[PDB]
Design an enzyme around this catalytic site. Structure first.
Site, PDB file in Angstrom:
ATOM      1  N   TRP A 147       0.782  -1.217   0.000  1.00 56.98           N
ATOM      2  CA  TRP A 147       0.000   0.000   0.000  1.00 56.98           C
ATOM      3  C   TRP A 147       0.826   1.285   0.000  1.00 56.98           C
ATOM      4  O   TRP A 147       0.376   2.293  -0.511  1.00 56.98           O
ATOM      5  CB  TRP A 147      -1.149  -0.055   1.025  1.00 56.98           C
ATOM      6  CG  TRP A 147      -2.250  -0.793   0.369  1.00 56.98           C
ATOM      7  CD1 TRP A 147      -2.919  -0.413  -0.774  1.00 56.98           C
ATOM      8  CD2 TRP A 147      -2.749  -2.088   0.710  1.00 56.98           C
ATOM      9  NE1 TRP A 147      -3.820  -1.382  -1.142  1.00 56.98           N
ATOM     10  CE2 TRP A 147      -3.741  -2.426  -0.248  1.00 56.98           C
ATOM     11  CE3 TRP A 147      -2.472  -2.993   1.736  1.00 56.98           C
ATOM     12  CZ2 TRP A 147      -4.460  -3.611  -0.203  1.00 56.98           C
ATOM     13  CZ3 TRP A 147      -3.185  -4.176   1.782  1.00 56.98           C
ATOM     14  CH2 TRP A 147      -4.173  -4.475   0.817  1.00 56.98           C
TER      15      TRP A 147
ATOM     16  N   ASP B 251      -1.743   6.366   6.821  1.00 59.85           N
ATOM     17  CA  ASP B 251      -2.768   5.495   6.296  1.00 59.85           C
ATOM     18  C   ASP B 251      -2.995   4.464   7.403  1.00 59.85           C
ATOM     19  O   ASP B 251      -2.179   3.570   7.621  1.00 59.85           O
ATOM     20  CB  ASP B 251      -2.306   4.834   4.966  1.00 59.85           C
ATOM     21  CG  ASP B 251      -3.251   3.713   4.470  1.00 59.85           C
ATOM     22  OD1 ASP B 251      -4.341   3.527   5.055  1.00 59.85           O
ATOM     23  OD2 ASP B 251      -2.893   3.014   3.475  1.00 59.85           O
TER      24      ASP B 251
ATOM     25  N   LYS C  62     -12.384  -1.932   7.032  1.00 61.04           N
ATOM     26  CA  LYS C  62     -11.647  -2.932   7.783  1.00 61.04           C
ATOM     27  C   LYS C  62     -12.141  -2.940   9.197  1.00 61.04           C
ATOM     28  O   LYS C  62     -12.535  -3.965   9.734  1.00 61.04           O
ATOM     29  CB  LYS C  62     -10.159  -2.656   7.756  1.00 61.04           C
ATOM     30  CG  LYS C  62      -9.479  -3.323   6.609  1.00 61.04           C
ATOM     31  CD  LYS C  62      -9.334  -2.421   5.425  1.00 61.04           C
ATOM     32  CE  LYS C  62      -8.467  -3.094   4.387  1.00 61.04           C
ATOM     33  NZ  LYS C  62      -8.775  -2.527   3.058  1.00 61.04           N
TER      34      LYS C  62
END
Lengths: 358, 358
Positions: free
Chosen positions: A100, A167, A191
């Site tokens: 990511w 993040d 999530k």
């Protein structure tokens, strides 16, 4: 007979939140319509919209230096919004810790940002968080808090004068966080904070000042969403309604310290199952960097046992365990909504599978 | 006691779709989890995801010249993605017919696109579709099919050799359309196609070629999404499953001709109620351009009666009728999901209200 669901995202939801949404899907609070079915510009939606912003801030003990924004496009849109908004003529520094951050780096580079990767665990296949030292004069400093695929997670965020960008998608609302140097903290909601299609962004006021001096499309402009309180265009009303139920659910549990204690209990038990397996299971992550959210491991001796492990897990009502393609093996995601007893079911299954196949 | 819901967006949904969604919210097809709760890259989500693409194409009788993309960010993000992808060194022609076209125009200008406004209804407060002449050599020509606030709607799309871009958010899947020279046809889905947070883009292959040569963020690149079948990142899985149930609902009705004919019936009845009111009600839109979707009207001789109208309508079980601030008055949105009996109920209210207050 609901399955125990270890998916990495979208992920399992607290049943009581699902139940509440079900019972009132056609008739929200007896008002005679679905929450899915009205304008965002109603007193009723606003209550939900603005209550969610406030509860998120309470959970994290955020002060008025931050705005809570509700945007669409998942965390991936942020990889582009972040540089578009908060970049200047300076260097933008990134720490490379997984799939990511690689992606985030690529997007900033595409935008022609001057990007510096100040640290990286790629050589080692991202199996640990490297020593990260940011410079004190960069335009911003960027990290990914929890690397969902590799199962590594920062224990402490790096200290720097440079505006820190985090993040936090896959550890969102999982534990208290020190915001001292944090300029922007965000997560894909799906999530640990609801359903996909919604991202929650905490943005500090000095960053909004940066958006103000930029000439970019409204939808891509943080300041534009700030000034309009995340109702510049239609927000994902249902998603926000779910987030808000999630906020309440996090509150009713005792807040982030309580959530964090339960999470540590769950992780400890699962990692113990790995470490006490006489080497039959082996984790991808360096022990110092073991994520509390995503546990990536392999059956060390015999990889061909992995698809067998996944199928038998499924037959026993446990799903979502296949490791990400890029890494293989097994991945148990044990987000907030998974409880200690469900993790114990996985642990008993792991012992049984080993007793059978070792 | 379900209200008759005339909201302009998000809008009312076919109760049978809501009942299905409710029923299986915790346990999709008896599989042991919610549709909201599993990965987009399972065969189960993929079936919904790719089925919705095919049926959308079936309803519009489209061939393989078009890809169907499912994106986040509403119509508003398209105001930006359109010129970011499809714009060239040429001029991009826009027809100004409402607030949404003015917004789209502004966003292209922000991106430094060469915008020409070839026609405009603004001078007469957008009460009609002006005469629209696009040149044959522009990069693209942009229109808004149905102007939601003013209640005007193109009867026929302009004919031109320049690639035509159509914002069909507020009349999406309401009628058959001639795609002869349409290069991109899109909508925010929450007017006629389900819930907010999802947009459906029909994009002709030659347009994707233009994206191919653009250096822009992956999330904002049409080709990126076409190439990854709208699964470059986590799509809004719930929204997409809702859309698919919508698609089945449209098919079960006999397709777009049948839908359009039911909508003509409804609009014809409302407009008669207005026209036969001896001047008491008056419509904003010039008659030739009256929308079938959004009927915008005023109480001609007494403005102060409008908030009374809205409130009484409310106690009589009808919501969403307050006109947009820009125009005031009343606004009845009669999207696919509203039936002629519901439009009859409003007409009877309108007649009674007039009797009371005229």
């Amino acid at each position: 007979m609901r399955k125990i669901n270890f998916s990495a995202g979208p992920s399992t939801l607290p049943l009581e939140i699902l139940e509440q949404a079900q019972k009132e899907l056609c008739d929200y609070q007896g008002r005679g319509y679905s929450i899915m079915e009205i304008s965002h510009r109603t007193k009723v939606f606003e209550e939900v919209h603005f209550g969610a912003q406030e509860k998120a801030k309470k959970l994290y003990e955020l002060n008025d230096d931050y705005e809570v924004l509700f945007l669409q496009g998942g965390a991936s849109l942020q990889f582009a919004m972040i540089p578009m908004n908060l970049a200047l003529n300076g260097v933008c520094e990134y720490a490379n810790t997984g799939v990511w951050t690689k992606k985030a780096i690529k997007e900033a580079q595409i935008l022609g940002v001057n990007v510096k990767t100040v640290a990286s665990s790629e050589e080692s296949n991202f199996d640990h968080i490297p020593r990260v030292e940011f410079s004190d004069n960069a335009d911003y400093a960027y990290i990914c808090s929890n690397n969902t695929i590799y199962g590594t997670q920062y224990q402490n965020y790096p200290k720097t004068k440079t505006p820190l960008i985090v993040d936090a998608s896959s550890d969102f609302f999982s534990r208290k966080v020190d915001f001292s140097n944090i300029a922007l903290f965000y997560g894909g909601v799906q999530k640990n904070a609801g359903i996909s299609g919604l991202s929650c962004i905490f943005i500090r006021k000095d960053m909004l000042e940066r958006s103000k001096n930029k000439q970019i499309p409204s939808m891509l402009n943080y300041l534009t969403h700030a000034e309009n309180q995340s109702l510049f265009n239609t927000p994902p009303t249902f998603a926000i309604y779910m987030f808000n139920l999630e906020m309440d659910w996090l509150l009713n549990q005792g807040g982030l310290d309580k959530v964090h204690e339960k999470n540590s209990q769950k992780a400890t038990m699962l990692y113990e199952c790995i470490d006490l397996s006489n080497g039959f299971y082996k984790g991808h992550a360096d022990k110092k960097d073991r994520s509390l959210m995503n546990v990536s491991f392999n059956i060390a001796k015999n990889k061909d046992l992995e698809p067998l492990f996944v199928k038998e897990a499924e037959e026993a009502g446990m799903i979502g365990l296949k490791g990400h393609r890029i890494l293989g093996g097994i991945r148990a995601s044990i987000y907030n909504a998974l409880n200690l007893d469900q993790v114990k079911t996985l642990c008993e299954f792991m012992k049984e599978f080993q007793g059978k196949y070792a």
